[PDB]
Symmetry: D2
Subunit: 325 residues, 4 copies
């Protein structure tokens, strides 16, 4: 009756949302995995009544032993890549190691946080390890005969990125620090195409999307899921923020990738991601058109499966600004 689901990164944003969503369904038993059960965040997960296991993804045997009995697993990696991984050893990423360990432990159903490979799609003329490592994990999971289901889920930009101070530093004053001309100014290169920039409130929605996948894993196997709460251009984001907060805001694109300030190291290292996205006419996920219909179908299903508990629709940018500003 009861299906156990191991949650990687349960102390983190993606896995944290996953754990919080799945625990609200009696058909599932959540086994959070963390490196330190004494962690501040781990104790918060232990206050929700969640089973907590301590293990390190870089230890395949220990990980395999910690996933022994899981019906499903949600896998993700971290913001910091090891030098070996940053230099093209994508098989050494702890997320990818965990996926292989799950194969050995016999876990039948996998939901894997993934990203497109700029290298694979551009014929080798681009290399963006931050994305390509997760894409490697997706290539391994899709080809593995052991799994009964492997579904890649691709996260959008978090709305919560607006709370990172260097975010405010890098991309113009937007959305907290106004400039000399009195504007909350956002400065980013265009995405390309029709400027269909995807955004999500990671906390409230991502976990419910993964939950919806686990409600019927066979239907979603080997079919990429885009975790998208809203789709709008940078300029529409600014006008929406201004309407909500009644604070002047504007968008000034970085049309020339070479003419971005070297003062900003998050613009210079992202210049290959931005170029790959532009080359793809803004189709940043690589599998097909950017659409949030599936996400709105995976959120409603989790809503029903949870007992009509919580919210039935994903958080839009307008609502996030109304709730956070």
């Amino acid at each position: 009756e009861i299906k156990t689901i191991s949650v990687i990164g349960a102390t983190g944003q993606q896995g944290g949302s996953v754990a919080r969503s799945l625990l609200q369904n009696p058909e599932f038993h959540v086994r959070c995995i963390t490196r330190d059960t004494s962690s501040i965040k781990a104790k918060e997960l232990k206050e929700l009544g969640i089973e907590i296991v301590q293990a390190d993804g870089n230890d395949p045997t220990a990980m395999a032993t910690a996933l022994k009995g899981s019906w499903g697993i949600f896998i993700n990696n971290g913001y910091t890549l090891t030098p070996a991984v940053q230099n093209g050893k994508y098989e050494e990423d702890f997320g990818n190691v965990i996926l292989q360990s799950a194969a050995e432990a016999g876990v039948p159903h996998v939901v894997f946080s993934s990203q497109p490979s700029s290298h694979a799609l551009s014929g080798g003329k681009f290399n963006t390890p931050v994305l390509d490592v997760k894409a490697w994990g997706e290539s391994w999971g899709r080809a593995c005969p052991t799994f009964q289901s492997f579904t890649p889920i691709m996260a959008s930009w978090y709305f919560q990125n607006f709370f990172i101070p260097s975010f405010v530093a890098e991309f113009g004053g937007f959305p907290w620090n106004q400039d000399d001309e009195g504007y909350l100014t956002l400065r980013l290169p265009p995405l390309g195409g029709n400027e269909e920039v995807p955004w999500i409130c990671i906390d409230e929605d991502f976990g419910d999307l993964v939950h919806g996948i686990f409600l019927n894993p066979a239907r979603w196997s080997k079919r990429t899921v885009q975790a998208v709460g809203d789709i709008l251009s940078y300029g529409d984001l600014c006008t929406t923020f201004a309407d909500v907060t009644q604070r002047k805001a504007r968008y000034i694109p970085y049309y020339d990738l070479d003419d971005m300030p070297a003062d900003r190291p998050y613009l210079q290292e992202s210049r290959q991601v931005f170029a790959f996205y532009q080359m793809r006419d803004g189709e940043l996920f690589g599998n097909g058109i950017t659409e949030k219909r599936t996400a709105s179908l995976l959120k409603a299903a989790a809503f029903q499966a949870k007992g009509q508990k919580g919210r039935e629709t994903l958080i839009t940018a307008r609502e996030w600004f109304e709730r956070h500003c």
Copy 2:
């Protein structure tokens, strides 16, 4: 063989209507103008179009010039008389023509229209440029003589980018670079999700009216939105930048009270649009599906002549910038 009188055939809207209808042998175009010796009048003559001289302000003359018309397209001008400006919308030459068409027994009417901000805002707003046409719309909707009366509502013309005064007031976009090197567009937000409608008046509007005349009964009393593309002002600028590789940006006029130097009294229109959450047409959501259908229908009625699809903002920039 159905005869159609075309008001404003020397103008943008009526000109597109005449040029589109002429390519369907089932329809015979009778252009109406005040001056048949005009350059534009002669251009219409060079295409082999019948040109009759009449003034909309003369109901008696106009009734005589419409006799025998199966249908009529009606439009007015940018110029309102002081009397019309001050509320006597029955005197606008377009609405006079509509009443004359009723007198002459013309059975099928397509009327260039706009919503009445005054009527929709409970009196808060007064915009004669729109409300005058709305007067004709209600009159035609209530008139029992017509067999069909269909209102058509034009979006912003792309060709407004060629009006020097438009370039003057709304920033430099898309011709005049500013100090920081940007083609800058300065406009109040439309409201809602910034679904700003635009049309290439020359190539598409006439085809939409043509499509209406292909089945007047199905469109009677149903407003048609003449929309070629739907996008936000910022999308306009990013599209322009991609097409031309000329830096461009959008800086909204957030406060209609603190606008600059730039005496365009279109403020009440902008405020009414915002009050409608951007639903500038007033009848329902902004949609171009109907326009696309009508354009394709004209394409096929004309013999697969011309374009089957409406001109988008990107294509307009490609062809004119």
Copy 3:
């Protein structure tokens, strides 16, 4: 501060949903209007704690006095038209009389249950009083200079038509009586165009749309609102029913309107169907059929009620899941 709203037909389906929706917002006070406060349905409302006033729409003066003090009014009419109304004299329908009474009483904000006029749209070819009676009221209210806001709202096919017996008899066994070959068969003419048939759960959704309008009446003045919960073809409706209930169902079109059973109200429905086909299925007459606006209004009411109820409209799949997998066929409707 607290805005009073009179609800016509509060004992009925449309007004009942309106009352039940506006009751959950303390900014509004619901004054139900009924002819008989002793009714089973009226006492149901009294048991819910709703003010009940007795008045008859056919009495303009009494109606005016009973509407006095209302900030807003929801107006609707009934399924049975007097013969005089049947033959024109649309001004005499109690809904339209009530609209004029509200104008006399000075009610500033109006939401009116409406439908397109086939006669006005067809150049006289068609005459369907079931629609045209409400269209008369719609134009009268649109032209009325006294109202501060006037919004016409138009109902789609109720899902609850499946509980109305007259629906079950004529339009095939669907969805309760299986037919000779074991099929739940629906027998109806095509709508026209791409078969974009609108449906709504009248009980749970219609009232929330009226509520959403009253939340910002100025923005909706003179703007037709389509009360649409789902848009799907008749065949898609039947296949969805089959998927939900694992019970055979099918759609049998009347391709020839002359071959449709027309044994007085079936004659008015033949003309209505012909008008819809003549409009390529654009049965509302003002523009394309769309449920986007309905969704916006439903969400707005959801928020206003304190995030109570559902944020989304009920689809055909949801309705079949809730009312067929598990329902007495005795609801109010056309008396054929």
Copy 4:
């Protein structure tokens, strides 16, 4: 001038590809066939297209017959060898050709593909008609030599109405009248919202392959759904009825066990439809069914061809108005397709 080899150029898919690309001076169409003396091979020759003779089952000859190609469009046939029917998907002549194209150094590939029901369902389904093409898709996606590899996935052809086995097996629609005077279509539901995709293979498909070749890098490793219209089976029949004024209807096989499964291809189609219903109608497996991209690849080819032809895809209504309203005797029901009985 960039040369593109076209597999199956004498067939429906490759034929549309050749006819579309030839009208664009930036490309050279090199048709590939087993028999250059064929009556359909001579039609292509009458169009002014190079015709080379090679067999896909001969990897070396195929390699020498592709060398010099800037791009290649790859497709397979309706008949699979017994070895291929039984799993040996590497032996399908289309997949051998794909390996030959890498072998030959063709830098840009457009591969006719379908999802693998087995791969997506954890082994619950085995439908070689789709999975064979999916094998080639996986190989092309993983091959490091190609500069671009784009899978394109065909919908139901409207031209299935000209394939005789379709008319026989699936109730007779739209040509064979039944007891009650109905053109009856008999098919299981697709699943989900009955978003059945259809395309006019002749007029539209080639333009989509062409649009991909207009910017291969932007489409590399991105599945393209070749869709002209999206509608339910019942909507298909009612649309046909409106166009032709002939009674027509759709009678679903709600229970797949009640579908005629006399012959082996009908049972493999039962398993395919079961897979579709399993995926809630997502018959392509990569994502939602959509025709926006197809409408973007048709318009782009329209422009590339010199604004010649149609800018838009053919809808079901327009196809019925073009092929089933007039008698049009030249439209005979003899097209290549599944040979069931």
